[PDB]
Amino acid sequence: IEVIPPSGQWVTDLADLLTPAEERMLSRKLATYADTTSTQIVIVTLPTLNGVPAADYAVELGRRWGVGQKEYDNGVVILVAREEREVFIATGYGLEGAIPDALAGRIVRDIIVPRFRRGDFYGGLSAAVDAIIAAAQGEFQP
Ligand SMILES: [Mg+2]
């Protein structure tokens, strides 16, 4: 599997879902969380996965980019595959148990997808970040 190379960005919006101001606001939140906790959460948006499963892509991007390694200790990839209408939340092994499949799925189904169907990409991703941070803190309360 070949994924995109490391961007150096908290938000890599290759589907161009977000305005620059929306990217900068998400990026500030993500960077601040990483600074305080050493947990690196990144957002990647892609026009298409070209037939690669979202799970496989998210895991390879976390590996290739070293998400949650190097300067950081734990990692999350939020991968948005626009053509396939998939959102895959991938956590590093360190965070095993913090976001089970049902909690990730409920973030996608109930938090992200209804916002995305209205064109509210910033709100859906912002709320997903907040839910991920709450879950990583042991404080997610659906
Ligand atoms: Mg953009």
PDB file of all heavy atoms in Angstrom, residues 80-82 84-89 104-121 123-125 127-128:
ATOM      1  N   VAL A  80     -10.437  10.946   6.472  1.00  0.00           N
ATOM      2  CA  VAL A  80     -11.685  11.204   5.732  1.00  0.00           C
ATOM      3  C   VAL A  80     -11.431  10.849   4.273  1.00  0.00           C
ATOM      4  O   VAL A  80     -10.552  11.471   3.658  1.00  0.00           O
ATOM      5  CB  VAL A  80     -12.127  12.653   5.867  1.00  0.00           C
ATOM      6  CG1 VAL A  80     -13.356  12.911   5.032  1.00  0.00           C
ATOM      7  CG2 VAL A  80     -12.375  12.985   7.319  1.00  0.00           C
ATOM      8  N   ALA A  81     -12.166   9.864   3.745  1.00  0.00           N
ATOM      9  CA  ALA A  81     -12.050   9.416   2.349  1.00  0.00           C
ATOM     10  C   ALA A  81     -13.341   9.905   1.731  1.00  0.00           C
ATOM     11  O   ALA A  81     -14.437   9.315   2.031  1.00  0.00           O
ATOM     12  CB  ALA A  81     -11.921   7.918   2.255  1.00  0.00           C
ATOM     13  N   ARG A  82     -13.313  10.964   0.958  1.00  0.00           N
ATOM     14  CA  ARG A  82     -14.532  11.650   0.515  1.00  0.00           C
ATOM     15  C   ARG A  82     -15.292  10.779  -0.482  1.00  0.00           C
ATOM     16  O   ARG A  82     -16.541  10.590  -0.241  1.00  0.00           O
ATOM     17  CB  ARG A  82     -14.113  13.013  -0.018  1.00  0.00           C
ATOM     18  CG  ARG A  82     -15.223  13.987  -0.353  1.00  0.00           C
ATOM     19  CD  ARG A  82     -16.102  14.246   0.861  1.00  0.00           C
ATOM     20  NE  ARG A  82     -17.207  15.078   0.509  1.00  0.00           N
ATOM     21  CZ  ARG A  82     -18.398  15.028   1.093  1.00  0.00           C
ATOM     22  NH1 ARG A  82     -18.623  14.225   2.114  1.00  0.00           N
ATOM     23  NH2 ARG A  82     -19.338  15.817   0.624  1.00  0.00           N
ATOM     24  N   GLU A  84     -15.509   7.644  -1.014  1.00  0.00           N
ATOM     25  CA  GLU A  84     -16.017   6.399  -0.397  1.00  0.00           C
ATOM     26  C   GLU A  84     -16.937   6.739   0.771  1.00  0.00           C
ATOM     27  O   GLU A  84     -17.595   5.788   1.312  1.00  0.00           O
ATOM     28  CB  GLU A  84     -14.837   5.566   0.091  1.00  0.00           C
ATOM     29  CG  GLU A  84     -13.939   5.118  -1.050  1.00  0.00           C
ATOM     30  CD  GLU A  84     -12.939   6.142  -1.598  1.00  0.00           C
ATOM     31  OE1 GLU A  84     -12.762   7.198  -1.004  1.00  0.00           O
ATOM     32  OE2 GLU A  84     -12.312   5.850  -2.605  1.00  0.00           O
ATOM     33  N   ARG A  85     -17.059   8.001   1.155  1.00  0.00           N
ATOM     34  CA  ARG A  85     -17.825   8.456   2.325  1.00  0.00           C
ATOM     35  C   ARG A  85     -17.444   7.614   3.531  1.00  0.00           C
ATOM     36  O   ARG A  85     -18.355   7.090   4.246  1.00  0.00           O
ATOM     37  CB  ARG A  85     -19.327   8.407   2.019  1.00  0.00           C
ATOM     38  CG  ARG A  85     -19.711   9.393   0.937  1.00  0.00           C
ATOM     39  CD  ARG A  85     -19.444  10.806   1.367  1.00  0.00           C
ATOM     40  NE  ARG A  85     -20.227  11.749   0.586  1.00  0.00           N
ATOM     41  CZ  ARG A  85     -19.861  12.332  -0.550  1.00  0.00           C
ATOM     42  NH1 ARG A  85     -18.693  12.111  -1.117  1.00  0.00           N
ATOM     43  NH2 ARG A  85     -20.737  13.127  -1.156  1.00  0.00           N
ATOM     44  N   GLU A  86     -16.150   7.500   3.790  1.00  0.00           N
ATOM     45  CA  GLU A  86     -15.650   6.779   4.966  1.00  0.00           C
ATOM     46  C   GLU A  86     -14.919   7.739   5.877  1.00  0.00           C
ATOM     47  O   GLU A  86     -14.196   8.679   5.371  1.00  0.00           O
ATOM     48  CB  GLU A  86     -14.829   5.619   4.475  1.00  0.00           C
ATOM     49  CG  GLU A  86     -15.758   4.498   4.096  1.00  0.00           C
ATOM     50  CD  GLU A  86     -15.072   3.310   3.506  1.00  0.00           C
ATOM     51  OE1 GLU A  86     -13.893   3.103   3.809  1.00  0.00           O
ATOM     52  OE2 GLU A  86     -15.752   2.562   2.784  1.00  0.00           O
ATOM     53  N   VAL A  87     -15.034   7.526   7.168  1.00  0.00           N
ATOM     54  CA  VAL A  87     -14.187   8.202   8.173  1.00  0.00           C
ATOM     55  C   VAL A  87     -13.590   7.162   9.062  1.00  0.00           C
ATOM     56  O   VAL A  87     -14.406   6.415   9.731  1.00  0.00           O
ATOM     57  CB  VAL A  87     -14.905   9.242   9.004  1.00  0.00           C
ATOM     58  CG1 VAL A  87     -13.947   9.879   9.968  1.00  0.00           C
ATOM     59  CG2 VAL A  87     -15.520  10.315   8.140  1.00  0.00           C
ATOM     60  N   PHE A  88     -12.318   6.980   9.056  1.00  0.00           N
ATOM     61  CA  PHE A  88     -11.674   5.911   9.838  1.00  0.00           C
ATOM     62  C   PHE A  88     -10.887   6.587  10.960  1.00  0.00           C
ATOM     63  O   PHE A  88      -9.956   7.415  10.682  1.00  0.00           O
ATOM     64  CB  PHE A  88     -10.774   5.046   8.951  1.00  0.00           C
ATOM     65  CG  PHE A  88     -10.418   3.775   9.662  1.00  0.00           C
ATOM     66  CD1 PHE A  88     -11.216   2.645   9.529  1.00  0.00           C
ATOM     67  CD2 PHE A  88      -9.307   3.717  10.486  1.00  0.00           C
ATOM     68  CE1 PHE A  88     -10.897   1.483  10.202  1.00  0.00           C
ATOM     69  CE2 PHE A  88      -9.000   2.549  11.168  1.00  0.00           C
ATOM     70  CZ  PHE A  88      -9.799   1.431  11.017  1.00  0.00           C
ATOM     71  N   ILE A  89     -11.164   6.223  12.218  1.00  0.00           N
ATOM     72  CA  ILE A  89     -10.373   6.701  13.369  1.00  0.00           C
ATOM     73  C   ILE A  89      -9.436   5.589  13.740  1.00  0.00           C
ATOM     74  O   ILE A  89      -9.923   4.470  14.136  1.00  0.00           O
ATOM     75  CB  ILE A  89     -11.306   7.115  14.510  1.00  0.00           C
ATOM     76  CG1 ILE A  89     -12.157   8.303  14.118  1.00  0.00           C
ATOM     77  CG2 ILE A  89     -10.486   7.395  15.763  1.00  0.00           C
ATOM     78  CD1 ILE A  89     -13.339   8.548  15.037  1.00  0.00           C
ATOM     79  N   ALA A 104     -15.852   4.908  18.267  1.00  0.00           N
ATOM     80  CA  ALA A 104     -15.460   5.501  16.966  1.00  0.00           C
ATOM     81  C   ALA A 104     -16.657   5.572  16.028  1.00  0.00           C
ATOM     82  O   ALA A 104     -16.873   6.582  15.361  1.00  0.00           O
ATOM     83  CB  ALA A 104     -14.301   4.768  16.388  1.00  0.00           C
ATOM     84  N   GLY A 105     -17.421   4.458  15.933  1.00  0.00           N
ATOM     85  CA  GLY A 105     -18.545   4.432  15.010  1.00  0.00           C
ATOM     86  C   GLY A 105     -19.609   5.412  15.368  1.00  0.00           C
ATOM     87  O   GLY A 105     -20.314   5.926  14.479  1.00  0.00           O
ATOM     88  N   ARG A 106     -19.845   5.577  16.680  1.00  0.00           N
ATOM     89  CA  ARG A 106     -20.867   6.542  17.136  1.00  0.00           C
ATOM     90  C   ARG A 106     -20.417   7.979  16.842  1.00  0.00           C
ATOM     91  O   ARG A 106     -21.210   8.788  16.353  1.00  0.00           O
ATOM     92  CB  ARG A 106     -21.125   6.431  18.628  1.00  0.00           C
ATOM     93  CG  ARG A 106     -22.376   7.198  19.030  1.00  0.00           C
ATOM     94  CD  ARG A 106     -22.819   6.820  20.428  1.00  0.00           C
ATOM     95  NE  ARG A 106     -21.806   7.290  21.343  1.00  0.00           N
ATOM     96  CZ  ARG A 106     -21.566   8.573  21.602  1.00  0.00           C
ATOM     97  NH1 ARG A 106     -22.287   9.548  21.069  1.00  0.00           N
ATOM     98  NH2 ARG A 106     -20.607   8.890  22.442  1.00  0.00           N
ATOM     99  N   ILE A 107     -19.119   8.276  16.996  1.00  0.00           N
ATOM    100  CA  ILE A 107     -18.557   9.595  16.562  1.00  0.00           C
ATOM    101  C   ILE A 107     -18.810   9.807  15.091  1.00  0.00           C
ATOM    102  O   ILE A 107     -19.376  10.825  14.692  1.00  0.00           O
ATOM    103  CB  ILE A 107     -17.072   9.700  16.943  1.00  0.00           C
ATOM    104  CG1 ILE A 107     -16.862   9.721  18.463  1.00  0.00           C
ATOM    105  CG2 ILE A 107     -16.454  10.923  16.263  1.00  0.00           C
ATOM    106  CD1 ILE A 107     -15.415   9.472  18.948  1.00  0.00           C
ATOM    107  N   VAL A 108     -18.545   8.783  14.265  1.00  0.00           N
ATOM    108  CA  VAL A 108     -18.754   8.940  12.814  1.00  0.00           C
ATOM    109  C   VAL A 108     -20.255   9.124  12.526  1.00  0.00           C
ATOM    110  O   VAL A 108     -20.645   9.979  11.775  1.00  0.00           O
ATOM    111  CB  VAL A 108     -18.064   7.781  12.070  1.00  0.00           C
ATOM    112  CG1 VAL A 108     -18.378   7.835  10.606  1.00  0.00           C
ATOM    113  CG2 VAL A 108     -16.551   7.860  12.336  1.00  0.00           C
ATOM    114  N   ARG A 109     -21.081   8.162  12.954  1.00  0.00           N
ATOM    115  CA  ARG A 109     -22.511   8.096  12.561  1.00  0.00           C
ATOM    116  C   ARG A 109     -23.282   9.294  13.131  1.00  0.00           C
ATOM    117  O   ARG A 109     -24.122   9.848  12.410  1.00  0.00           O
ATOM    118  CB  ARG A 109     -23.150   6.823  13.092  1.00  0.00           C
ATOM    119  CG  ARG A 109     -24.567   6.612  12.575  1.00  0.00           C
ATOM    120  CD  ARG A 109     -25.146   5.330  13.096  1.00  0.00           C
ATOM    121  NE  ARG A 109     -24.488   4.206  12.501  1.00  0.00           N
ATOM    122  CZ  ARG A 109     -24.756   2.927  12.788  1.00  0.00           C
ATOM    123  NH1 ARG A 109     -25.608   2.618  13.757  1.00  0.00           N
ATOM    124  NH2 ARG A 109     -24.059   2.007  12.172  1.00  0.00           N
ATOM    125  N   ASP A 110     -23.016   9.624  14.370  1.00  0.00           N
ATOM    126  CA  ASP A 110     -23.935  10.586  15.045  1.00  0.00           C
ATOM    127  C   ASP A 110     -23.347  11.995  15.058  1.00  0.00           C
ATOM    128  O   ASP A 110     -24.132  12.938  15.230  1.00  0.00           O
ATOM    129  CB  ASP A 110     -24.267  10.097  16.448  1.00  0.00           C
ATOM    130  CG  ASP A 110     -25.184   8.880  16.489  1.00  0.00           C
ATOM    131  OD1 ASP A 110     -25.642   8.440  15.433  1.00  0.00           O
ATOM    132  OD2 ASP A 110     -25.382   8.372  17.604  1.00  0.00           O
ATOM    133  N   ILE A 111     -22.016  12.144  15.040  1.00  0.00           N
ATOM    134  CA  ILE A 111     -21.346  13.451  15.257  1.00  0.00           C
ATOM    135  C   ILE A 111     -20.917  13.974  13.893  1.00  0.00           C
ATOM    136  O   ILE A 111     -21.270  15.107  13.526  1.00  0.00           O
ATOM    137  CB  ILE A 111     -20.220  13.395  16.291  1.00  0.00           C
ATOM    138  CG1 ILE A 111     -20.766  13.062  17.680  1.00  0.00           C
ATOM    139  CG2 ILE A 111     -19.467  14.728  16.308  1.00  0.00           C
ATOM    140  CD1 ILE A 111     -19.742  12.947  18.791  1.00  0.00           C
ATOM    141  N   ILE A 112     -20.132  13.169  13.156  1.00  0.00           N
ATOM    142  CA  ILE A 112     -19.528  13.617  11.885  1.00  0.00           C
ATOM    143  C   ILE A 112     -20.583  13.652  10.774  1.00  0.00           C
ATOM    144  O   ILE A 112     -20.712  14.680  10.110  1.00  0.00           O
ATOM    145  CB  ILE A 112     -18.304  12.745  11.544  1.00  0.00           C
ATOM    146  CG1 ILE A 112     -17.258  12.851  12.652  1.00  0.00           C
ATOM    147  CG2 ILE A 112     -17.773  13.125  10.176  1.00  0.00           C
ATOM    148  CD1 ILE A 112     -15.961  12.130  12.324  1.00  0.00           C
ATOM    149  N   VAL A 113     -21.136  12.479  10.416  1.00  0.00           N
ATOM    150  CA  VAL A 113     -21.910  12.311   9.145  1.00  0.00           C
ATOM    151  C   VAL A 113     -23.073  13.301   9.012  1.00  0.00           C
ATOM    152  O   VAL A 113     -23.191  13.902   7.969  1.00  0.00           O
ATOM    153  CB  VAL A 113     -22.360  10.845   8.952  1.00  0.00           C
ATOM    154  CG1 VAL A 113     -23.378  10.684   7.829  1.00  0.00           C
ATOM    155  CG2 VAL A 113     -21.169   9.942   8.669  1.00  0.00           C
ATOM    156  N   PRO A 114     -23.872  13.571  10.056  1.00  0.00           N
ATOM    157  CA  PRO A 114     -24.971  14.525   9.915  1.00  0.00           C
ATOM    158  C   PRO A 114     -24.491  15.944   9.598  1.00  0.00           C
ATOM    159  O   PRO A 114     -25.058  16.640   8.766  1.00  0.00           O
ATOM    160  CB  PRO A 114     -25.683  14.467  11.276  1.00  0.00           C
ATOM    161  CG  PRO A 114     -25.298  13.160  11.858  1.00  0.00           C
ATOM    162  CD  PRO A 114     -23.879  12.898  11.352  1.00  0.00           C
ATOM    163  N   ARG A 115     -23.335  16.344  10.200  1.00  0.00           N
ATOM    164  CA  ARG A 115     -22.705  17.630   9.910  1.00  0.00           C
ATOM    165  C   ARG A 115     -22.204  17.611   8.472  1.00  0.00           C
ATOM    166  O   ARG A 115     -22.413  18.550   7.764  1.00  0.00           O
ATOM    167  CB  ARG A 115     -21.676  17.902  11.009  1.00  0.00           C
ATOM    168  CG  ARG A 115     -22.346  18.268  12.325  1.00  0.00           C
ATOM    169  CD  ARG A 115     -21.339  18.527  13.440  1.00  0.00           C
ATOM    170  NE  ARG A 115     -21.979  18.933  14.691  1.00  0.00           N
ATOM    171  CZ  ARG A 115     -22.495  20.099  14.902  1.00  0.00           C
ATOM    172  NH1 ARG A 115     -22.248  21.112  14.110  1.00  0.00           N
ATOM    173  NH2 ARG A 115     -23.099  20.311  16.071  1.00  0.00           N
ATOM    174  N   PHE A 116     -21.414  16.592   8.080  1.00  0.00           N
ATOM    175  CA  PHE A 116     -20.906  16.520   6.680  1.00  0.00           C
ATOM    176  C   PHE A 116     -22.041  16.562   5.618  1.00  0.00           C
ATOM    177  O   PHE A 116     -21.834  17.261   4.640  1.00  0.00           O
ATOM    178  CB  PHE A 116     -20.081  15.253   6.503  1.00  0.00           C
ATOM    179  CG  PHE A 116     -18.670  15.312   7.036  1.00  0.00           C
ATOM    180  CD1 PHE A 116     -18.252  16.203   8.023  1.00  0.00           C
ATOM    181  CD2 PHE A 116     -17.772  14.370   6.608  1.00  0.00           C
ATOM    182  CE1 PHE A 116     -16.914  16.190   8.458  1.00  0.00           C
ATOM    183  CE2 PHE A 116     -16.447  14.355   7.036  1.00  0.00           C
ATOM    184  CZ  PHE A 116     -16.028  15.236   7.985  1.00  0.00           C
ATOM    185  N   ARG A 117     -23.182  15.987   5.944  1.00  0.00           N
ATOM    186  CA  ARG A 117     -24.276  15.998   4.922  1.00  0.00           C
ATOM    187  C   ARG A 117     -24.855  17.383   4.693  1.00  0.00           C
ATOM    188  O   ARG A 117     -25.466  17.556   3.600  1.00  0.00           O
ATOM    189  CB  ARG A 117     -25.340  14.984   5.292  1.00  0.00           C
ATOM    190  CG  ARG A 117     -24.873  13.586   4.968  1.00  0.00           C
ATOM    191  CD  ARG A 117     -26.015  12.633   4.838  1.00  0.00           C
ATOM    192  NE  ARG A 117     -25.471  11.294   4.790  1.00  0.00           N
ATOM    193  CZ  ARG A 117     -26.197  10.214   4.595  1.00  0.00           C
ATOM    194  NH1 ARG A 117     -27.494  10.329   4.374  1.00  0.00           N
ATOM    195  NH2 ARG A 117     -25.617   9.029   4.600  1.00  0.00           N
ATOM    196  N   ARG A 118     -24.649  18.308   5.632  1.00  0.00           N
ATOM    197  CA  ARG A 118     -25.047  19.733   5.611  1.00  0.00           C
ATOM    198  C   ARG A 118     -23.902  20.577   5.051  1.00  0.00           C
ATOM    199  O   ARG A 118     -24.023  21.800   5.022  1.00  0.00           O
ATOM    200  CB  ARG A 118     -25.437  20.259   7.012  1.00  0.00           C
ATOM    201  CG  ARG A 118     -26.432  19.377   7.751  1.00  0.00           C
ATOM    202  CD  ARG A 118     -26.962  20.052   9.002  1.00  0.00           C
ATOM    203  NE  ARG A 118     -27.843  19.084   9.654  1.00  0.00           N
ATOM    204  CZ  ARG A 118     -27.588  18.443  10.792  1.00  0.00           C
ATOM    205  NH1 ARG A 118     -26.475  18.683  11.473  1.00  0.00           N
ATOM    206  NH2 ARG A 118     -28.467  17.565  11.251  1.00  0.00           N
ATOM    207  N   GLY A 119     -22.720  19.987   4.756  1.00  0.00           N
ATOM    208  CA  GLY A 119     -21.571  20.789   4.308  1.00  0.00           C
ATOM    209  C   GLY A 119     -20.767  21.327   5.494  1.00  0.00           C
ATOM    210  O   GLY A 119     -19.875  22.099   5.279  1.00  0.00           O
ATOM    211  N   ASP A 120     -21.118  20.917   6.734  1.00  0.00           N
ATOM    212  CA  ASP A 120     -20.420  21.405   7.960  1.00  0.00           C
ATOM    213  C   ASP A 120     -19.236  20.486   8.281  1.00  0.00           C
ATOM    214  O   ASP A 120     -19.216  19.773   9.295  1.00  0.00           O
ATOM    215  CB  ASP A 120     -21.414  21.502   9.101  1.00  0.00           C
ATOM    216  CG  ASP A 120     -20.760  22.020  10.349  1.00  0.00           C
ATOM    217  OD1 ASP A 120     -19.744  22.710  10.217  1.00  0.00           O
ATOM    218  OD2 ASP A 120     -21.325  21.785  11.442  1.00  0.00           O
ATOM    219  N   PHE A 121     -18.249  20.573   7.427  1.00  0.00           N
ATOM    220  CA  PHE A 121     -17.007  19.777   7.596  1.00  0.00           C
ATOM    221  C   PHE A 121     -16.208  20.251   8.805  1.00  0.00           C
ATOM    222  O   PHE A 121     -15.700  19.370   9.541  1.00  0.00           O
ATOM    223  CB  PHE A 121     -16.170  19.780   6.310  1.00  0.00           C
ATOM    224  CG  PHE A 121     -16.947  19.247   5.130  1.00  0.00           C
ATOM    225  CD1 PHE A 121     -17.376  20.085   4.124  1.00  0.00           C
ATOM    226  CD2 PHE A 121     -17.212  17.926   5.054  1.00  0.00           C
ATOM    227  CE1 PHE A 121     -18.132  19.590   3.053  1.00  0.00           C
ATOM    228  CE2 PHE A 121     -17.970  17.418   3.994  1.00  0.00           C
ATOM    229  CZ  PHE A 121     -18.437  18.271   3.034  1.00  0.00           C
ATOM    230  N   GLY A 123     -17.391  21.707  11.531  1.00  0.00           N
ATOM    231  CA  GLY A 123     -18.069  21.335  12.775  1.00  0.00           C
ATOM    232  C   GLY A 123     -17.988  19.853  13.045  1.00  0.00           C
ATOM    233  O   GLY A 123     -17.876  19.425  14.197  1.00  0.00           O
ATOM    234  N   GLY A 124     -18.151  19.031  12.005  1.00  0.00           N
ATOM    235  CA  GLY A 124     -18.044  17.598  12.197  1.00  0.00           C
ATOM    236  C   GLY A 124     -16.651  17.189  12.661  1.00  0.00           C
ATOM    237  O   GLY A 124     -16.536  16.387  13.587  1.00  0.00           O
ATOM    238  N   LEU A 125     -15.602  17.731  12.046  1.00  0.00           N
ATOM    239  CA  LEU A 125     -14.248  17.334  12.470  1.00  0.00           C
ATOM    240  C   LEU A 125     -13.923  17.928  13.831  1.00  0.00           C
ATOM    241  O   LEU A 125     -13.259  17.263  14.659  1.00  0.00           O
ATOM    242  CB  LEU A 125     -13.259  17.826  11.426  1.00  0.00           C
ATOM    243  CG  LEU A 125     -13.249  16.954  10.158  1.00  0.00           C
ATOM    244  CD1 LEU A 125     -12.512  17.645   9.043  1.00  0.00           C
ATOM    245  CD2 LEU A 125     -12.664  15.590  10.430  1.00  0.00           C
ATOM    246  N   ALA A 127     -15.950  18.549  16.356  1.00  0.00           N
ATOM    247  CA  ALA A 127     -16.653  17.745  17.349  1.00  0.00           C
ATOM    248  C   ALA A 127     -16.030  16.378  17.488  1.00  0.00           C
ATOM    249  O   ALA A 127     -15.963  15.849  18.611  1.00  0.00           O
ATOM    250  CB  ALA A 127     -18.111  17.662  17.040  1.00  0.00           C
ATOM    251  N   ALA A 128     -15.571  15.787  16.413  1.00  0.00           N
ATOM    252  CA  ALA A 128     -14.887  14.484  16.491  1.00  0.00           C
ATOM    253  C   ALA A 128     -13.593  14.625  17.298  1.00  0.00           C
ATOM    254  O   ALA A 128     -13.335  13.742  18.134  1.00  0.00           O
ATOM    255  CB  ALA A 128     -14.642  13.988  15.114  1.00  0.00           C
TER     256      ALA A 128
END
